[PDB]
Amino acid sequence: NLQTFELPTEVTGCAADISLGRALIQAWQKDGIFQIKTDSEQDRKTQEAMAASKQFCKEPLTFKSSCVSDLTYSGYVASGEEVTAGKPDFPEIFTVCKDLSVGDQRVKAGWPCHGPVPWPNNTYQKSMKTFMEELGLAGERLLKLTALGFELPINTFTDLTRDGWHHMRVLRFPPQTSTLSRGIGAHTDYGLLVIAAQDDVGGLYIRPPVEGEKRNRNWLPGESSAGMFEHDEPWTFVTPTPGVWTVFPGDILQFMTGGQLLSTPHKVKLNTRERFACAYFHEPNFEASAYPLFEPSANERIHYGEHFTNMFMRCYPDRITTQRINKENRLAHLEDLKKYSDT
Ligand SMILES: [Mn+2]
């Protein structure tokens, strides 16, 4: 089985917190993933979110397709729209980004990707927001522990994630309907930290670090991780397990740690029945830049808002959100915000 940890409610930097942080890092370095225990409220909120997702996916496609916005990428993506390593993927997705009203300063100013979630209804909204509040508390604990485990100042990562661009993919994978069962191909996630939850069906596989195996830096053009290793062992089945979430590093943690953590490759196999899952990304602030922690003389950076916006424009090039960015030249706002700051 995967390793399982219980996180303290508060992380203070005591020697035992540092020891736990070291154990989390070791588990990522050995297995690529670990489990964290959920308490009764965390578990209840997870199950409610999955139930809301199932109910929404039963709504007619005409209704689901109306849950879209030209200000934010939040909302519905039909099956077959996302592509991994050139092949369309199978799940239907509702993406929840930061839910900002039109009166928020950033929405008023037209910042790309900022706007109100096009929620299907208030009951779904409440289920997702409550769940994401708990996921965020866990993400902050994890990032303090990770800093401590590397002997870094406790707030090294959480300074970047203040008002972070946290977002969640609420997924339904269809049952297998032919010889094809690649629900999503092998890939690595583009963000900082991933917390994943799933129902009891099963289908997620992850790749641990492999001694001697070359890994691409997926944040760079020309070093895509997509499709790599898909048909070669090892792939660990993430067995559905009551009372846990799983946690793995994304591309930005690989970048910041110089590869001491690797962004965990993962893929999904369609089951013989539908599968519900949620993938939560605990992210830097839209205005924050990731930087190499252990190479002080390296000048490379990842500006998070640019990273996110470019990714979503490339993945959803015909969505009304992308069209409006182009029509109103909203990328110019990112250039402007990068100004008068200390690089
Ligand atoms: Mn993924």
Angstrom CA distances, 261 to 184, 201, 307, 312, 342, stand at 23, 29, 20, 25, 27
**Alpha-carbon torsion angle 273, 278, 279, 283, nearest 10:** 170
Residues with CB under 5 A from ligand 1 (ion): 189
* Single-letter residue type at 297: S
Q: How far is the CA of 14 from the centre of ligand 1 (A)?
A: 33
Question: What is the CB-side half-sphere exposure of residue 39 using CA atoms within 13 A?
Answer: 9
Query: Which technique?
Result: X-ray
Q: Which domain holds residue 275?
A: 1-343
Domain count, the chain: 1
Q: How far is the CA of 12 from the centre of ligand 1 (A)?
A: 31
Q: How far is the CA of 66 from the centre of ligand 1 (A)?
A: 25
Q: How far is the CA of 287 from the centre of ligand 1 (A)?
A: 23
What's the rounded Cα separation, in Å, for the pair 59 and 92? Answer: 12
Angstrom CA distances, 67 to 15, 29, 176, 184, 204, stand at 48, 39, 26, 23, 27
What are the φ/ψ torsions at residue 46 (nearest 5 degrees)?
-60, -50
Instruction: Name the residue among 32, 20, 51, 50 with its Cα closest to residue 238.
Output: 32
What's the rounded Cα separation, in Å, for the pair 122 and 100? Answer: 15
What's the rounded Cα separation, in Å, for the pair 3 and 34? Answer: 5
Angstrom CA distances, 331 to 237, 317, 326, 328, stand at 40, 14, 8, 9
What's the rounded Cα separation, in Å, for the pair 254 and 236? Answer: 20
Judge whether 167 is annotated as a binding position: no
Kindly report the three-state secondary structure assignment for every residue of the chain: CCCEECCCCCCCCCHHHHHHHHHHHHHHHHHCCEEEECCHHHHHHHHHHHHHHHHHHCCCHHHHCCCCCCCCCCEEECCCCCEECCEECCCEEEEECCECCCCCHHHHCCCCCCECCCCCCHHHHHHHHHHHHHHHHHHHHHHHHHHHHCCCCCCCCCCCCCCCCCEEEEEEECCCCCCCCEEEEEECCCCCEEEEEECCCCCEEECCCCCCCCCCCCCCCCCCCCCCCCCCCCCEECCCCCCEEEEEECHHHHHHCCCCCCCCCEEEECCCCCEEEEEEEECCCCCCEECCCCCCCCCCCEEHHHHHHHHHHHHCCCCHHHHHHHHCCCHHHHHHHCCCCCC
Judge whether 307 is annotated as a binding position: no
What's the Rg (C-alpha) of the chain?
19
